[PDB]
Amino acid sequence: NTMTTDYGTHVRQLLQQGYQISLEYADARRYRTSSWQSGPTLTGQQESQVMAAIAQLLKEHEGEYVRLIGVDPKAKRRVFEEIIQRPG
Ligand SMILES: [Cl-]
Ligand SMILES: [Co+2]
C-alpha cells in the first residue's frame, strides 16, 4: 500500500470554490530535488469524475509521490498544494 491523505475534502472544496485542479508526481530521485513532473489538469467539475480520475492516477503512481494542486484560473497562481500520496 501507499501513504495517502484524506484528499476528497480538498477536491470538493476546490471544485466548490471554482479553482482548477491539477496534479504532479515524482519518483524518489525527483522528489529529493523538488523536480516534480507534470500531471493532468482535470477538466471535470463533477466531484465523482475528478475523484475517479485521481484514484486511477494514484494507482499508477504507487511507490511514488503525488501532489494535488489548486490554481486560481484568473491569476494562474497556486492556491492549494498537498502531497496526497507518498511511498508506503
Ligand atoms: Cl475529471
Ligand atoms: Co489536508
Technique used: X-ray
Resolution (Å) of this entry? 1.4
Distance 41 CA to ligand 1 centre (A): 8
Question: Percent helix, strand, coil in the chain (nearest 5)?
Answer: 35, 40, 30
Q: Is 82 left (phi over 0), alpha (psi -120 to 50) or beta?
A: beta
Ligand nearest to the CA of residue 23, numbered in listed order: 1
Query: How many other C-beta atoms lie within 10 A of the C-beta of residue 60?
Result: 11
Ligand nearest to the CA of residue 84, numbered in listed order: 2
Distance 34 CA to ligand 1 centre (A): 26
CA distance 43 to 31: 26
| 26 SS3 class | strand
Distance 22 CA to ligand 1 centre (A): 10
Q: Give the three cell numbers for residue 26.
A: 515524482
Domain ranges of the chain: 1-88
Element (H, E) at 11: helix 8-17
Burial of 42 (0-12, 13-18, 19+ CB in 10 A): buried
CA distance 84 to 69: 10
